[PDB]
What we know:
The structure is a homotrimer. Helices cover 73% and strands 5% of the residues of chain A. The N and C termini of chain A lie far apart (50 Å). The first copy, chain A, has 7 helices and 2 strands, in the order H-H-E-E-H-H-H-H-H. Chain A is mainly alpha-helical. One retinal is lined by residues 82, 85-86, 89, 114-115, 118, 121, 134, 137-138, 141, 172, 175-176, 179, 202, 205-206 of chain B.
Amino acid sequence: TGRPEWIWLALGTALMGLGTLYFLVKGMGVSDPDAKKFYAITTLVPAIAFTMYLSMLLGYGLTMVPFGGEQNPIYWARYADWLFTTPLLLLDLALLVDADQGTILALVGADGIMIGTGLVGALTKVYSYRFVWWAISTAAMLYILYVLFFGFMRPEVASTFKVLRNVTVVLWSAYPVVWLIGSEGAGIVPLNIETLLFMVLDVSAKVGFGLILLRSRAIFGE
Amino acid sequence: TGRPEWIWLALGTALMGLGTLYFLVKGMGVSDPDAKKFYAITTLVPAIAFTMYLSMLLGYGLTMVPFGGEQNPIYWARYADWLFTTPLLLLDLALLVDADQGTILALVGADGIMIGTGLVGALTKVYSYRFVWWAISTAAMLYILYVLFFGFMRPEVASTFKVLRNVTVVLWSAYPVVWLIGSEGAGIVPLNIETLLFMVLDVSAKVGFGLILLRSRAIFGE
Amino acid sequence: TGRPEWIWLALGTALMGLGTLYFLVKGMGVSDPDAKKFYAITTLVPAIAFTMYLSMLLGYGLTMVPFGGEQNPIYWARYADWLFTTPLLLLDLALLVDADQGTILALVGADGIMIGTGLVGALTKVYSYRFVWWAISTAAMLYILYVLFFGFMRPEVASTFKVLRNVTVVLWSAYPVVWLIGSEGAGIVPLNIETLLFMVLDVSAKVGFGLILLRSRAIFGE
Lengths: 222, 222, 222
Ligand SMILES: *C/C=C(C)/C=C/C=C(C)/C=C/C1=C(C)CCCC1(C)C
Ligand SMILES: *C/C=C(C)/C=C/C=C(C)/C=C/C1=C(C)CCCC1(C)C
Ligand SMILES: *C/C=C(C)/C=C/C=C(C)/C=C/C1=C(C)CCCC1(C)C
C-alpha cells in the first residue's frame, strides 16, 4: 500500500495468523481441563492480534490525531489488541502458578489501566499531556512486573513460569520505550521503524511466549 | 418515524421488554444457586437487547458509513447488543453441561472475535474489505458451532442442551446470511426487510431460547 | 484552567490519587486470599477513578453534545469510570456476604445496563429522549438496590455488610438526582456545582467506602 509500514503490518498479520492456526492444531484432541485453559488462552491471543494487525493493514485501525501542529498517524487498533491480549497473557502466567483470585484481579485491573491510559495518551491532542499518560501507564506496568516477581511454588510449574515471566518482563518493558521514541511520543523514530519494532515484540510476546508455554508439559496432568 | 424500519425496531423493543419482564417475574422466589445463574443470564439477555433496540428506534444506535460512493445507514447498536448477549447465551449453554473453564473461555473469546470483526466489517469504508471481515467473523462462528457439537453428558441436562444447541445453531447461522444480503453487505435486501429479519432472529434467539431453557427443570436441583 | 469546574476535577484527582496510594500501602504484606480479593478490588476502584478524573481535568474526558439548540459540555469520562468502578464496588459487597454467582451476575449485568444507558442518555441529542434513558438507568439502579436488600448471613461479615450497603444505597441514589438537575438533564444546576456534587459523592463512595471496608476485619480470617 501507500504507507511504508505496510510490510510490517502484512508480516505481523501473517505471523499472528499462522501462530493461531498452529496453536489451534496443537490443541486439537486435548482433554485435560487445565491444558484446555492454557490452549484456549494461548490460541486466543494471536487470533485477536491477527484481527487487529489486519485492521491496521487495511487502514481501519489507523486514525489521525492533531498534536504539535500537525496530523499524526496513530494506530489505535494496537490498544484494542492489547486490551484483551495482555490480560490473557497475565492470566496464562497466573493460572500456571495457581495465583489466587485477588492477585489475578490486581493484575488484570492494573493491566486495563496500563492499556487504557496508553490509549488516552495515544489520542491526546495536547502534546505535553501525552507523556503524563505514558508515565501513569508505565507505573501500572511496573506494578504488574512487581507482582510477577513478589506477588505469587508448585514444582510442576516452577521452572516454566520462571522462563515465561522473564520473557514477559523483558519484552513488555520495551513497549513503553518504543512508544516514547516513536510517532506516539517524541517522534525520534519514524512510524515504519516503530511498526517494525512493535511487530517483533508482538510476535515474540504472543507466538514466541505461546510456543514456550504450549511446549512445556507444565500445562498437563499425566 | 421517518424510516420505514421503525415498526420492526418498535416491535423488537416491545418484545424484548415484555420478555425481560416475564423472565424477571418467573425468576422471583428462586432460591437454587444453579437456577439463579440461569435466570440471571437469561433475563439479562433480553434486557440488554431491549436497550439496544430502543437506541435503534430512537436513532442513537444508527450511524452513516460511506462506502460504494454513498451514505449507508448502519445500525451499530446491534453489535453492542451482540457483544454482551451472544456470550451470555453461550454461557447458558456451557453452564448447562458443566463445560470446563477452558471451553467457556474459548467460546467467549471466539464470540468476541465474531462480533468484533462483524462490527469492523459493518463500519469499513472500503466495500470489498467489508467481506473480508465477514469471512473472518463467519470462521469464528463456525468454530463456535464446532465446539457446541464436539467440545463438551449429565442426564439431568442432556436433552434440554440438545434442543437449545439446535435452536442456537439454526438461528445463529442465519445472521451471517442476513448481513451478507442486507444493507451491510451486498445490499440486495433493503434495510427495512433486513431489520425485520434480524428482529425475528433476535426475539427467537433470546426470548424464544429463554422460554425453552427456563421451562425445563434442567436448571433446578430438587 | 478556563473552566470553573477545574478545581473540583483537580481535587477529585488528588483525593482519588491519595486514596489509591493509601490502599496500596495498607494492602502490602497481606497474605490471606480473601483479604487479597478485597484489597485488590478496593484499591482498583480509586485508581480507575484517578485516571478518569485526570482525563476530565486535562480536557480529554469532555465532549460537546448538541441538544436544546446549543453545545453542552458533557464529561463522558465519568461513564468510563463508573463502567468499571461500580461493578467492582458491588463485587466487594457481594464477596463480603459470599453471594452466589447468579446474584453476582445479576448485579454486574444490571450495573452495566445502568451505566450504559446513562451514557446513552448523556450523549443523546434529542433532549426529551435523554430522560427516557435516565428512567431506564434508574430502574436498573432500583433493581440493584432491591437485590442489595432482598437478594442475598455469616456473622463474620453481617454488620460490616449492613453498614457498607447503607452507605452504598444513600450515595448511589443521589447520582440520578444530580444528573437529572445538572448539565446532562434539566440544567437547573450549573456544571461547576454538578461537578462538585459528583466529586463529593465519588470520593465518599470509593475512598470513604473503602476505608470502612478495609478497616473492618470482616475481610480477614485469623
Ligand atoms: C502482545 C502484546 C503485548 C504483550 C503488549 C504489551 C504492551 C505494553 C506492556 C504497553 C505498555 C505501554 C506503557 C507501559 C506506556 C504507555 C504506552 C504503552 C501502552 C505502549
Ligand atoms: C440475540 C442475538 C444473537 C444470538 C446474535 C447472533 C449474531 C451472530 C451469530 C452474528 C454473526 C455474524 C457473522 C458470523 C458474520 C458477520 C456478521 C455477523 C456479526 C452478523
Ligand atoms: C464511584 C462511583 C459511583 C458509585 C457511581 C455511581 C453512579 C450511579 C449510581 C449513577 C446512576 C445513574 C442513574 C441511575 C440514572 C442515569 C444517570 C446515572 C448514570 C448517573
